[PDB]
Curated annotation (Swiss-Prot):
Organism: Homo sapiens (Human)
Positions of disulphide bridges: none
Keyword Ubl conjugation belongs to the record: yes
Expressed in which tissues: Brain, heart, placenta, pancreas and skeletal muscle. Expressed to a lesser extent in lung, liver and kidney.
Name of the top EC class for this enzyme: transferase
PTM field: Dual phosphorylation can also be mediated by TAB1-mediated autophosphorylation. TCR engagement in T-cells also leads to Tyr-303 phosphorylation by ZAP70. Dephosphorylated and inactivated by DUPS1, DUSP10 and DUSP16. PPM1D also mediates dephosphorylation and inactivation of MAPK14.
One of the GO BP terms on file: cell morphogenesis
Reported effect, Y162F: Loss of kinase activity
Subunit details: Component of a signaling complex containing at least AKAP13, PKN1, MAPK14, ZAK and MAP2K3. Within this complex, AKAP13 interacts directly with PKN1, which in turn recruits MAPK14, MAP2K3 and ZAK. Binds to a kinase interaction motif within the protein tyrosine phosphatase, PTPRR. This interaction retains MAPK14 in the cytoplasm and prevents nuclear accumulation. Interacts with SPAG9 and GADD45A. Interacts with CDC25B, CDC25C, DUSP1, DUSP10, DUSP16, NP60, SUPT20H and TAB1. Interacts with casein kinase II subunits CSNK2A1 and CSNK2B. Interacts with PPM1D.
Result when mutating P302R: In a lung adenocarcinoma sample; somatic mutation
Known function: Serine/threonine kinase which acts as an essential component of the MAP kinase signal transduction pathway. MAPK14 is one of the four p38 MAPKs which play an important role in the cascades of cellular responses evoked by extracellular stimuli such as pro-inflammatory cytokines or physical stress leading to direct activation of transcription factors. Accordingly, p38 MAPKs phosphorylate a broad range of proteins and it has been estimated that they may have approximately 200 to 300 substrates each. (Microbial infection) Activated by phosphorylation by M.tuberculosis EsxA in T-cells leading to inhibition of IFN-gamma production; phosphorylation is apparent within 15 minutes and is inhibited by kinase-specific inhibitors SB203580 and siRNA.
Name of protein: Mitogen-activated protein kinase 14
Gene Ontology MF: a single term: protein serine kinase activity
UniProt similarity note: Belongs to the protein kinase superfamily. CMGC Ser/Thr protein kinase family. MAP kinase subfamily.
Amino acid sequence: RPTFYRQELNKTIWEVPERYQNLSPVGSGAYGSVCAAFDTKTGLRVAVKKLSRPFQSIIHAKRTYRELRLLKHMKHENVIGLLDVFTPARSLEEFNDVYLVTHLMGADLNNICQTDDHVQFLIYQILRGLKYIHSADIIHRDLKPSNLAVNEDCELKILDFYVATRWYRAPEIMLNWMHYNQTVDIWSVGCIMAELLTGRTLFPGTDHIDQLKLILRLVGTPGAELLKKISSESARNYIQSLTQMPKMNFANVFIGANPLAVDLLEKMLVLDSDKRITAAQALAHAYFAQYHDPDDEPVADPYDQSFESRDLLIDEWKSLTYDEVISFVPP
Ligand SMILES: Cc1cn(-c2cc(NC(=O)c3ccc(C)c(Nc4nccc(-c5cccnc5)n4)c3)cc(C(F)(F)F)c2)cn1
């Protein structure tokens, strides 16, 4: 049981074991604050996240539990993994804060390591990690370049932490569809891969409405029947007021690109989420022929999400979270 020191960072009091030094605030939000640090015990650069009031509400406590459970379960080369989890509390009765620790990566996909081969390798790794995540019955929902970390040797890792999420969000989420499926993440991959191919953001909308119009300008406005699978009533009415836009031929948009990459993008960037390619299907596409290895593209061990159906109070989620903290074993 180590010694903690205190330091006021990100408008809050950080209490961390002395092994973590050189704390430097990275960013913050309503769901936590992140610092880069140096772990003197391993010699690693790490990221430390302090969850912001994790037990203020039932949903806060449940998602605190949800994140810790999820992260303790992820064992994949292309998904961020947990190096440590700690609390300064000495007992459940004073348990109020939770800290998570991962590797610090040298870069994200916005800031780059190294061609068509380099786009293939990066997108392959995203899809390899997504196949794993999706096999655990988890949807990322927030994929964007700043959530994709890359080390020196261009090994990529998916995480969840300017660069707007809206630029990469699936249209059915933008149109207020509540019942979307895992391929919302594939839409995001298509937008990311377009930007790696051309150098430019595919749909850099300045606002909610601008985003929809830029999307429809490329894929074409949907018919009424398609609208009812991807959109809520007020969004359907608005889309139906717009001039008809035809689908563009992606070959004239991604001029010069590998024709197999264009074919893959045509399968990713479709409005019909029942027609959109899955991560496992995309990994088998001929575009990735030089890296595709079904024996090295594993699924996840079964992930017990039955807690998602439990109706628990704040103190009950707090209690389960505490037990996940004190049972953690580092890799
Ligand atoms: C409520 C909820 C959360 N999630 C979920 C959480 C994470 N967490 C992290 O990635 C995470 C948690 C703690 C830490 C410390 C970090 N590390 C981190 N965070 C922000 C930035 C950086 C960073 C900064 C600079 C360079 N490299 C990394 N690292 C990640 C990851 C996923 C997924 F799907 F992507 F796997 C899902 C699901 N439901």
